[PDB]
Amino acid sequence: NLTIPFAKGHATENDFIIIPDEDARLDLTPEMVVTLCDRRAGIGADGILRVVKAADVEGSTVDPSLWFMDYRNADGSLAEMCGNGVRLFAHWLYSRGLVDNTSFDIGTRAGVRHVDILQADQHSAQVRVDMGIPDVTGLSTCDINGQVFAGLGVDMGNPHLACVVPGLSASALADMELRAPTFDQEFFPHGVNVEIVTELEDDAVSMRVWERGVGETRSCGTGTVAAACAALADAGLGEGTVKVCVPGGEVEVQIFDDGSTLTGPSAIIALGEVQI
Amino acid sequence: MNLTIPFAKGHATENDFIIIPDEDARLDLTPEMVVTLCDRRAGIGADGILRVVKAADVEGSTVDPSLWFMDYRNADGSLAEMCGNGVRLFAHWLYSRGLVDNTSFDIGTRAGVRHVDILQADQHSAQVRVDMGIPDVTGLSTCDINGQVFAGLGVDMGNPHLACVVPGLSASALADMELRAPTFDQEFFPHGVNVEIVTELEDDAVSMRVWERGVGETRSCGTGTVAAACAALADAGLGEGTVKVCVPGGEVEVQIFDDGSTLTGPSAIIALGEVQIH
Secondary structure: OOEEEEEEEEEOOEEEEEEEOOOOOOOOOHHHHHHHHOOOOOOOOOEEEEEEEHHHOOOOOOOOOOEEEEEEEOOOOEOOOOOHHHHHHHHHHHHOOOOOOOEEEEEOOOOOEEEEEEEEOOOEEEEEEEOOOOEEEEEEEEEOOOOEEEEEEEEOOOEEEEEEOOOOOHHHHHHOOOOOOEEOOOOOOOOOEEEEEOOOEOOEEEEEEEEOOOEEEOOOHHHHHHHHHHHHHOOOOOOEEEEEEEOOEEEEEEEEOOEEEEEEEEEEEEEEEEEO | OOOEEEEEEEEEOOEEEEEEEOOOOOOOOOHHHHHHHHOOOOOOOOOEEEEEEEHHHOOOOOOOOOOEEEEEEEOOOOEOOOOHHHHHHHHHHHHHOOOOOOOEEEEEOOOOOEEEEEEEEOOOEEEEEEEOOOOEEEEEEEEEEOOEEEEEEEEEOOOEEEEEEOOOOOHHHHHHOOOOOOEEOOOOOOOOOEEEEEOOOEOOEEEEEEEEOOOEEEOOOHHHHHHHHHHHHHHOOOOOEEEEEEEOOEEEEEEEEOOEEEEEEEEEEEEEEEEEOO
């Protein structure tokens, strides 16, 4: 029935359909989302980022003149957390001349985010995003596939449990076989994302992640910040700069005593039109 | 370098492809490019690439040079022959973009010429019939899926099949089975096999699920639907007929004769655009 312009891109292989809607002319229903993000029947993504002014988003109470990351999960749901996504949305905004400043603010359902474009062209960027104060909630354990791991619990807006594993190489991490983890039920009352991480080594670590009711993913933004907190803690530091390697790429995490940042890439890989 | 390529994304009963128009045979499309494009998160994502090129510009093409050739690449980069589903989408592309003038026409493939008939088409949707050859029932064998033994029929459609029609299987209970990679007779199927689990012919229809060799479960297998319909007819004591086959990605209609078979089914063209390879 309607043909609309779109783009496809990803931030460390967490991939999105960007749908411009400057004039908020699109009623994008949860069934339309689910269709569009169907990898075999549609275009295929982890979600849609619709480009709209905060003004026009039902329920945003942020400054109405911001651009708002109207972010939908692949199941249609209104995402309340955001991560890697922000890097892509920032990239689109800056490269299409929708903002004109390398440093600006983005309306999201989790509140305003602040970003800094560090490099940007039509296809690639590096973006620094302010991720909030990590809330460390303490030691916990989990079981994956008949093995206990010590982790550090971390709240970034959503819960994580980051298990830094002394001895474990990047290879051995690669070779482990993951399964839905079991963990402390009462410690995590809304479930938990679990990261397995190597130890700080040249200010870097490698991570794999099991997201909450999703399973293994290529990249989880909030998760890389969690892993960085843990890897620092596992070494006796509370502040620092860590390169985190996930299956989808590399980010850089900065842990301050009063905040955190995530720095990493974004890619706009295709442009076209799609039918409803 | 990077390279920007015009493309389309489509599917045939949710067996999905990237179509890449290359009428002047200018694009050198390598296996590593194919892999990158077909990557669902770093690329566009698909089961394969259909490059639209004249058979005159494919080396080793058996067919008439004036035909369009489906230069079909699998997602892993390897060259392929034919796809029951993908031919439907290719036919749809050629016809809806005016590259052929008739509703009935031939297409070149690496398995030889294929004859298609456009039943309905516009820019987004179509219904296409393809002639799929005489099935060759190679024998009776069995498999084991996740502990449970199924009896079936060897079918050679150009590639090996064990179509297992299961008396007393409802569609409900087919949808709830847990599929795992089957075990099979390695002597009967020395090159692997595609396994279809099928219900029994009822009101001229069956439902199927398929585990494709080296790929696991898919939403649709074109040659599988034809194997499935053979087995369904043979389990009903018939040698010929028309069967609607329901796969998780949609519905098709198989006609079996003594001297051949056809597969009719849908095609959709979902998007158009341009893509930059890394």
